[PDB]
Design a protein around this nucleic acid. Structure first.
Ligand SMILES: [Mg+2]
Lengths: 69, 67, 89, 75, 82
RNA sequence: CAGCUUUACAGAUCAAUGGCGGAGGGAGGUCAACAUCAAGAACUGUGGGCGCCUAUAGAACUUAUAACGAACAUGGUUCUUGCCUUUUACCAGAACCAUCCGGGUGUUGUCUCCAUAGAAACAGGUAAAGCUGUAUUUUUU
């Protein structure tokens, strides 16, 4: 029920740490209570993009870092 | 013995409550602690002499200070 | 002006059932009735001055207060030449 | 704003080129198009393909994959 | 309500450290916390499991990944306990 | 309704150990005596660092339209007034002060009326009192 306050990070690029040392860059589109990140896809770790619009699952999230201030 | 049902028995006594060990301190007759309805009875009875002015504002420019 | 001891008077009259208030944040000024610049103007020294005499009284009295007027008898008026165009011709 | 439920409803009606990564898993990816949606994150995928990672197109068909072990989706 | 999670949210603002399941420690001002420890920090140093420090402005974390959180000595005093 | 913790039971082994022990009344009284109640909003002790600063325990009573009293007198001194004219006695204000009628607590002691036990738990059971309990993404499936 406690909504993770990502409205500070809405419509901003974020370095999402995810399972197995994998990174995801991309501007934020939305989210849910499980922290599932709906985001515009960008280059995945030299570097290369997979997809246009992505939805990452919360369970697979290690972290999400403020790329943009 | 209906409206004045509680006090009637003891209202006219030398010491209002010589015993009544719950309601007063004792026979030294130092302190008291009535229940509600008897207090109500007392209040009703006191209608002639009772202060009879709840609106504390009323004493405006008539307090001791004002005097 | 008229407001003075208003709260108190109200309280007295109302038997303490009239907790009244006054305040001034609107800055709602208004003309004092009666017209400034009159010779005779009013009647009283002690009594409150009439409605149509009031403004003049306020002015002259305030001048006295502020020390502008000379003595008891005086007048607020124009300091210009041509006899004030002979007092508006 | 777009919650994941609404973005997957776009993926449901579109049925556009999806690529799936898997939970607790780096060695393999999937490539298909979203066809189903559960109240959980379970989604059935038709035209799915097993795609080992760029460290080829291996065989796979239509799959109901248990969605609690999902990572990526992108239609 | 969780009395340790109570403490965490009360600890917002202080320079708190944080290590995850990954073993990569962090340290900076806390900003946000919830029932599930959806932690945010400011001015956070991010030491990787090897020891490679990377200073950064902010971070957001998911509670499932968190291992333990270094609180200061101020929360020892008051007022959550009694 | 289940778990734990507490009490009244029956008998217990009664070790284990605790704890209520080198266990010892209550209610009152027109009953005392003692302390003490107008003060930087205000009290006292304890340690420590040099009469004081610094941490620590405590603090009944009486109060903030300020007062032990939801109450109300009196006496003195001066200063002012009044009636007057000589003083008492007085008028009613002031500033000072005192007296008195009372009050509060706290502690002792007495006086009275009631009393009057030197041991109960543990293993549980019985009954009653205090809390908790009734997998499909972040705790535990
Ligand atoms: Mg003589």
């Amino acid at each position: 029920v406690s909504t993770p306050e990502l409205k500070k990070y809405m419509d901003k690029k974020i370095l999402l740490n995810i399972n197995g040392s994998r990174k995801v860059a991309g501007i934020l589109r939305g989210y849910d209570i499980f922290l599932n990140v709906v985001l515009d896809d960008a280059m995945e770790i030299n570097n290369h993009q997979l997809g246009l619009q992505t939805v990452i699952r919360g369970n697979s999230i290690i972290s999400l870092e403020a790329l943009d201030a | 013995s209906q409206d004045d049902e509680y006090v009637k028995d003891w209202l006219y006594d030398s010491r209002p409550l010589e015993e009544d060990s719950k309601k007063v301190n004792g026979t030294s007759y130092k302190k008291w602690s009535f229940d509600l309805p008897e207090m109500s009875n007392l209040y009703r009875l006191s209608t002639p002499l009772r202060d009879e002015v709840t609106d504390k504002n009323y004493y405006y420019l008539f307090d001791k200070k004002s005097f | 002006i008229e407001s003075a001891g208003f709260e108190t008077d109200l309280r007295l009259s109302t038997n303490g059932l009239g907790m009244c208030q006054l305040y001034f944040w609107h800055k709602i000024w208004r003309k004092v009735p009666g017209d400034v610049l009159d010779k005779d103007a009013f009647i009283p020294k002690l009594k409150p001055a009439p409605i149509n005499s009031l403004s003049r009284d306020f002015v002259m009295k305030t001048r006295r207060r502020k020390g502008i007027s000379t003595g008891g008898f005086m007048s607020n008026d124009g300091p210009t030449l041509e006899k004030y165009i002979s007092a508006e011709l | 704003m777009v919650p994941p439920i609404n973005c997957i409803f776009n993926f449901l009606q579109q049925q556009t080129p999806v690529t799936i990564w898997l939970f607790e898993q780096i060695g393999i990816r999937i490539k298909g198009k979203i066809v189903g949606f559960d109240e959980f994150m379970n989604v059935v995928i038709d035209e799915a393909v097993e795609i080992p990672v760029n460290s080829k197109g291996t065989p796979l068909g239509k799959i109901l994959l248990k969605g609690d072990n999902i990572t990526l989706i992108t239609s | 309500n969780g009395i340790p999670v109570k403490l965490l949210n009360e600890a917002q603002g202080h320079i708190v450290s944080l290590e995850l399941t990954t073993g990569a420690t962090y340290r900076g001002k806390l900003v946000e916390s919830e029932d599930s420890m959806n932690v945010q920090l400011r001015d956070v140093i991010a030491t990787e499991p090897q020891g490679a420090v990377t200073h950064m402005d902010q971070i957001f974390v998911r509670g499932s990944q968190i291992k333990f959180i270094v609180v200061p000595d101020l929360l020892k005093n008051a007022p959550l306990f009694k």
